[PDB]
Ligand SMILES: Cc1cc2nc3c(=O)[nH]c(=O)nc-3n(C[C@H](O)[C@H](O)[C@H](O)COP(=O)(O)OP(=O)(O)OC[C@H]3O[C@@H](n4cnc5c(N)ncnc54)[C@H](O)[C@@H]3O)c2cc1C
């Protein structure tokens with residue numbers, strides 16, 4: 001099935017690989033691009049899996065969702081009509097994009113520009129993109145809890161996880177979310193709405209003092225926690241899981257502070273591990289500080305190999321070495337890698353943006369280096385802007401309920417100016433003052 005040689009080989013069938021395939025086709029008319037994806041599904045966007053897909057009857061089957069504005073769209077980047085078969089890819093006139101699903105690259109030979117698949121098939125390439133993303137992390141407490149507890153714990157990542165958890169939300173009475181990040185908070189709000197109509201229970205616990213405590217300042221993290229609680233969620237901050245067992249058929253969670261939580265199903269949203277397995281056979285460098293494949297500003301690792309997406313630890317000429325795990329970063333970095341695979345030699349320059357929605361009432365947008373450990377200055381009026389500072393310069397911005405102004409935030413971080421009064425900068429976001 002898989003051809004023996006392909007000009008462009010994209011490893012992984014996710015957001016970064018699809019953006020690169022589109023970029024290659026637009027930069028090199030007639031290009032022949034092969035995507036090798038271990039998932040049986042075609043490339044699809046994941047943000048809807050924890051948001052729009054939950055705010056709707058046949059969605060689990062159609063996988064179509066209504067944006068907050070109303071326009072309906074599919075979760076897949078393109079219908080199967082957009083793609084060509086891997087068998088006909090070398091022969092179709094003016095080429096195309098093919099996806100080899102259900103196949104995993106298990107070995108990478110950088111010297112001979114060759115990969116070996118899980119079925120023994122070997123494919124030679126001229127240009128290669130590694131876009132393997134990552135796999136959800138699991139807490140050690142669940143790992144030493146036995147098959148019973150582990151069979152009742154969901155690692156939310158793929159379309160299959162959305163379907164399995166959606167079915168469980170209609171069968172069990174209590175679901176517990178372990179994780180205070182954006183994923184855990186969005187799932188809490190989503191399951192919260194589901195539970196308000198079915199009269200069930202949703203619990204979210206995490207070690208921080210409030211939701212997204214590692215991202216937003218304390219005063220805003222606490223505000224967000226109250227918003228999640230008002231969505232029908234029992235939020236337990238300052239909770240460190242000590243052990244997990246079964247008691248009376250239900251899962252029993254023991255916290256390091258003595259508290260106990262009884263539930264029927266657990267959803268662990270506790271971060272991501274970059275998929276760097278191919279670094280061994282390929283002799284590729286892994287970044288010790290951020291994880292992932294270490295690449296340069298052009299996202300290049302070796303002469304004919306690039307890395308994009310969650311798995312790429314790259315050099316930001318403006319902000320320093322980073323590894324970003326955002327949907328728009330996978331699109332931007334994937335688009336950039338695609339251009340550099342066709343001879344662009346362009347560095348990461350256009351800063352990708354981040355967003356999060358906790359329902360159609362609360363909305364976040366972020367750009368740059370956003371970390372609660374950095375010094376912050378917030379200007380609010382409901383809504384506001386939070387500046388993240390380093391060396392008296394704005395390196396990150398979080399827009400709270402402020403939309404259609406990301407270009408202004410991007411320009412601020414690019415100019416790298418030392419602003420005397422951040423209140424005047426807040427006026428740029430139509431805001432007319434806290435610190436941490
Ligand atoms: C539920 C959910 C909600 C999200 N919501 C948001 C949001 O609201 N805003 C936001 O900014 N970001 C969000 N994100 C993050 C965003 O989806 C990720 O940053 C993005 O999907 C990363 O794209 P990627 O191509 O780097 O990796 P992935 O999307 O993980 O794609 C990698 C693909 O490659 C496959 N693969 C891995 N190794 C191999 C191999 N050796 N051979 C073949 N195939 C392989 C993997 O199975 C996977 O199919 C969300 C993520 C999830 C899971």
Ligand SMILES: COc1cccc2c(N)ccnc12
Nearest residue numbers: 050182183186325326355356
């Ligand atoms: C770090 O980026 C992410 C990774 C995984 C999930 C999400 C999510 N649900 C919302 C926003 N960002 C996410």
